[PDB]
Write a protein that binds this ligand. Structure first.
Ligand SMILES: [Zn+2]
Ligand SMILES: [Zn+2]
Lengths: 210, 210
């Protein structure tokens, strides 16, 4: 799987344009804002966008999803249904940061643990990883050993759990039981900061010790 | 000032019907839900409802405000503007607890620190007390030494500050600098649990020591 990271919004979130090398069929993961910047990269890359994927219901991951879905004529898929309250609360999310109103978002379909999403010949496995948000999912490409994981895990950190319905014990358990077993060699693209691997975090991440 | 407490919603919130004894002009503070229960008490009390007052933007304090405002033909007044994001997020608030959708609420006017609200011959002084929510206000009747204070202070407790834009240092400072100086003899009607006085909390509330 090929990809391009597109930093979007004032929160500087790692939106991912991902695509199959043979078919050039593509997906956007977490198009958080800066819809024009995203469109410019998508259009200049020459790929065929087929879908928008959402890891979780937070503003900096979903702000441009509705505009891009309409622009390209593609579905918005994900996250898990427990984040519906966050997506319904997008106006409140944006108003809290003094930003322009982000409209409520209803995805074409929710995702569940164990779902398959096809990006041309790339098969993404969906893993439900709650703790940061109760509906947070991640996308795993087994063939390229690549994880697109939103705000579950960072290089030397983990997602905040002090939000409504956040749960630290739940988040750490999800990382250890669902992510780490995918293998040390797995690279992850987090929502913020630099990329890292699961192996490096297993042994160096201060939140994953004990 | 006369009053009647009307426990509403599954959160068992202390909605207040308050009124002037001479004129029988009345106000509702925090009509949180159970709109029929509220209407039954208001109508049976014989008072003339003139206004709805809001201490803060949380679901269990505002759920029935819009229906009652329309039913009686009265304004919704308060809280302070910083809670606009909470009122915009009412659908998200209710969806989070698996309840029926509560619509976004736009009050007739926001309140500010130092505002006067007239309930017949009762003059309420408005105090801005952030920390639980950034737009939280309280209503003080100096003549009857009575405070209607929402979720700022409880008997032996204080409002949670772990919500988005919550701030514990700010909440405690607001209590100590804006509430306690009103006098030890002041009775308060909190959003939850039994009534108490400012004097008792000053000396016994574990959150107010030091
Ligand atoms: Zn993020
Ligand atoms: Zn309350």
């Amino acid at each position: 799987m090929n990809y391009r990271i597109i930093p979007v919004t004032a929160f500087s979130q790692n939106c991912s344009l991902i695509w199959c090398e043979q078919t050039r069929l593509a997906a956007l993961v977490d198009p958080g804002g800066d819809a024009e910047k995203i469109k410019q990269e998508v259009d200049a890359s020459g790929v065929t966008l087929m879908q928008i994927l959402l890891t979780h219901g937070h503003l900096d991951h979903v702000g441009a999803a509705s505009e891009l879905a309409q622009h390209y004529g593609v579905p918005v898929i994900g996250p898990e249904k427990e984040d519906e309250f966050w997506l319904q609360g997008l106006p409140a999310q944006s108003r809290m940061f003094g930003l322009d109103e982000c409209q409520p978002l209803t995805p074409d379909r929710w995702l569940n643990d164990g779902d398959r999403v096809s990006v041309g010949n790339v098969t993404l496995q969906v893993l439900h990883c709650p703790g940061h948000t109760p509906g947070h999912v991640v996308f795993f490409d087994e063939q390229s050993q690549l994880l697109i994981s939103g705000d579950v895990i960072f290089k030397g950190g983990v997602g905040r759990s002090d939000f409504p319905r956040g749960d630290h014990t739940q988040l750490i358990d999800a990382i250890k039981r669902k992510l780490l077993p995918l293998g040390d060699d797995v690279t992850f693209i987090p929502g913020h900061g630099p990329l890292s691997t699961l192996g490096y975090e297993r042994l160096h991440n201060p939140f994953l010790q004990d």
